[PDB]
Design an enzyme around this catalytic site. Structure first.
Site, PDB file in Angstrom:
ATOM      1  N   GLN A 173       0.803  -1.222   0.000  1.00 33.49           N
ATOM      2  CA  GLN A 173       0.000   0.000   0.000  1.00 33.49           C
ATOM      3  C   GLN A 173       0.837   1.274   0.000  1.00 33.49           C
ATOM      4  OE1 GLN A 173      -0.736  -3.016   1.414  1.00 33.49           O
ATOM      5  NE2 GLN A 173      -1.831  -2.476   3.298  1.00 33.49           N
TER       6      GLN A 173
ATOM      7  N   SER B 196       3.283  -6.223   2.409  1.00 24.57           N
ATOM      8  CA  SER B 196       1.948  -5.855   2.906  1.00 24.57           C
ATOM      9  C   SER B 196       0.807  -6.581   2.158  1.00 24.57           C
ATOM     10  CB  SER B 196       1.781  -4.324   2.903  1.00 24.57           C
ATOM     11  OG  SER B 196       2.148  -3.766   4.152  1.00 24.57           O
ATOM     12  N   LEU B 197       0.263  -5.963   1.106  1.00 24.65           N
ATOM     13  CA  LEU B 197      -0.739  -6.599   0.244  1.00 24.65           C
ATOM     14  C   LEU B 197      -0.084  -7.556  -0.751  1.00 24.65           C
ATOM     15  CD1 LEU B 197      -3.627  -6.902  -0.969  1.00 24.65           C
ATOM     16  CD2 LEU B 197      -3.148  -4.822  -2.273  1.00 24.65           C
TER      17      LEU B 197
ATOM     18  N   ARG C  51     -11.162  -7.776   3.198  1.00 23.77           N
ATOM     19  CA  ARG C  51     -10.042  -7.521   4.117  1.00 23.77           C
ATOM     20  C   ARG C  51      -9.910  -6.035   4.461  1.00 23.77           C
ATOM     21  NH1 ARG C  51      -4.510  -6.533   2.844  1.00 23.77           N
ATOM     22  NH2 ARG C  51      -3.070  -7.045   4.559  1.00 23.77           N
TER      23      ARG C  51
ATOM     24  N   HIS D 114      -0.630  -3.926  10.392  1.00 30.30           N
ATOM     25  CA  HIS D 114       0.441  -4.725  11.016  1.00 30.30           C
ATOM     26  C   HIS D 114       0.730  -4.412  12.498  1.00 30.30           C
ATOM     27  CE1 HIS D 114       0.363  -5.157   6.859  1.00 30.30           C
ATOM     28  NE2 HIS D 114       1.604  -4.862   6.517  1.00 30.30           N
TER      29      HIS D 114
ATOM     30  N   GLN E 152       0.042 -12.123   9.630  1.00 35.33           N
ATOM     31  CA  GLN E 152       0.541 -10.948   8.894  1.00 35.33           C
ATOM     32  C   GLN E 152      -0.159  -9.661   9.332  1.00 35.33           C
ATOM     33  OE1 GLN E 152      -0.681 -10.343   4.761  1.00 35.33           O
ATOM     34  NE2 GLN E 152       1.413  -9.810   4.151  1.00 35.33           N
TER      35      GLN E 152
END
Lengths: 310, 78
Positions: free
Chosen positions: A11, A92-93, A117, A201, A250
């Site tokens: 992101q 991340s993604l 999500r 996170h 994660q």
């Protein structure tokens, strides 16, 4: 025989008119967003090009655009008949992008998962409750201390370890803002706030992660074609159960990107290709290793040069 | 006042080159080989110099030396 790996951005790499140059050169780019638009119920391509960014920065709309963008580059790479990558990894993604490209998750199924999500994360931390700050030019201990000093009974933690001298923090907005000033006081080169909707996170995401754990049990998970290194553990999982539990963990544990890049370097990989928009992960590569080359495949010019070398 | 003179001064001193050698028309990406973060560090020097705010979306789009000037002129105007 040389070896290369593909890395997928997270992101903050999304911007207006991404893949505009590549869409003219390849019809498959707009076909990928068209498949994603059928799932979403709105024209995802039209949102990306026309904008406005403020809508594109909303996490539940941000992540499907990044997934559709990243997979569209991979489809162009596979259509032209490019060299097969030795490893895969994603920030991340990017795990979801890498898992879709690896053949673990279906593309249309992943768009629902990735959209959902974003909504679950937004339910945990509302809009304006939290924020993220990239802290450049300071060691990890000094950043880690600075968060604990200024926490004041609120959740603050360093979450993304992108490179040595670049760490991202996330938590409650004011606590992150007060923490960011303390890092600049300690001698940080800059404390740059990201324009990200949700603090990812961190411990605030565990309520959303508990919901996400039940989602993944419904979704089907195939065997990976390429090895996918996860963020949370820096480990390659073959079984479906281990990948699901990694994606849940994660969401509320830090991204170990420095170790992920170093692990890729240990397996004989000489070059990284950023399969996605922008050039975020390319700039990190030289800071982490220095002798490991990299390039960002986000348009036709970069596509051909990258394809021609490997 | 005198934005071009200061934008020439700052970017010349940033890249460790003479003013005469620096070109406003040239492409900052690999004409002078400054990455994403170096541009973010430059952005902060522009904030401090002119007394204007800049965000990641704004400073990341600067490809030329003139593109930096045009941003500063519009910010001071508004």
């Amino acid at each position: 025989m040389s070896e290369f790996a593909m890395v997928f951005p997270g992101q903050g790499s999304q911007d207006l008119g991404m893949l505009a140059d590549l869409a003219t050169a390849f019809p498959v780019v707009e076909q990928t967003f068209a498949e994603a638009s059928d799932v979403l119920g709105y024209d995802l391509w039209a949102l990306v090009q026309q904008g406005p960014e403020e809508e594109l920065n909303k996490t539940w709309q941000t992540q499907p655009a990044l997934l559709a963008a990243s997979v569209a580059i991979w489809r162009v790479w596979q259509e032209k008949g490019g060299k097969a990558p030795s490893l895969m990894a994603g920030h991340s993604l990017g795990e979801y992008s890498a898992l879709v490209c690896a053949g673990v998750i279906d593309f249309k199924q992943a768009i629902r998962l990735v959209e959902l999500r974003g909504k679950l994360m937004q339910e945990a931390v509302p809009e304006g409750t939290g924020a993220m700050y990239v802290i450049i030019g300071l060691d990890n201990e000094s950043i880690d201390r600075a968060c604990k000093e200024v926490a004041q009974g609120q959740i603050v933690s360093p979450v993304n370890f992108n490179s040595p001298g670049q760490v991202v923090i996330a938590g409650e907005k004011e606590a992150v803002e007060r923490a960011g000033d303390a890092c600049k006081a300690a001698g940080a080169k800059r404390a740059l706030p990201l324009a990200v909707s949700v603090p990812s996170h961190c411990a605030l995401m565990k309520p959303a992660a508990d919901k996400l754990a039940v989602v993944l049990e419904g979704i089907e998970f195939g065997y990976p074609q390429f090895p996918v290194v996860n963020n949370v553990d820096v480990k390659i999982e073959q079984s479906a159960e281990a990948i699901r539990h990694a994606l849940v963990r994660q969401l509320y544990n830090p991204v170990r990107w420095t170790e992920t890049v170093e692990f890729i370097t240990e397996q004989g990989v000489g070059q990284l290709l950023e399969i996605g928009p922008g050039r975020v992960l390319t700039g990190l590569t030289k800071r982490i290793v220095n002798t490991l080359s990299a390039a960002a495949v986000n348009d036709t010019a970069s596509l051909i040069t990258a394809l021609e070398n490997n | 006042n005198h934005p071009e003179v200061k934008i020439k001064t700052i970017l010349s001193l940033f890249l460790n080159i003479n003013i005469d050698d620096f070109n406003m028309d040239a492409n900052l990406a690999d004409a002078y080989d400054m990455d994403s973060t170096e541009l973010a560090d430059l952005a902060k020097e522009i904030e401090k110099e002119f007394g204007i705010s800049v965000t990641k979306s704004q400073f990341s789009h600067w490809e030329t030396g003139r593109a930096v000037l045009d941003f500063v002129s519009s910010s001071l105007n508004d």
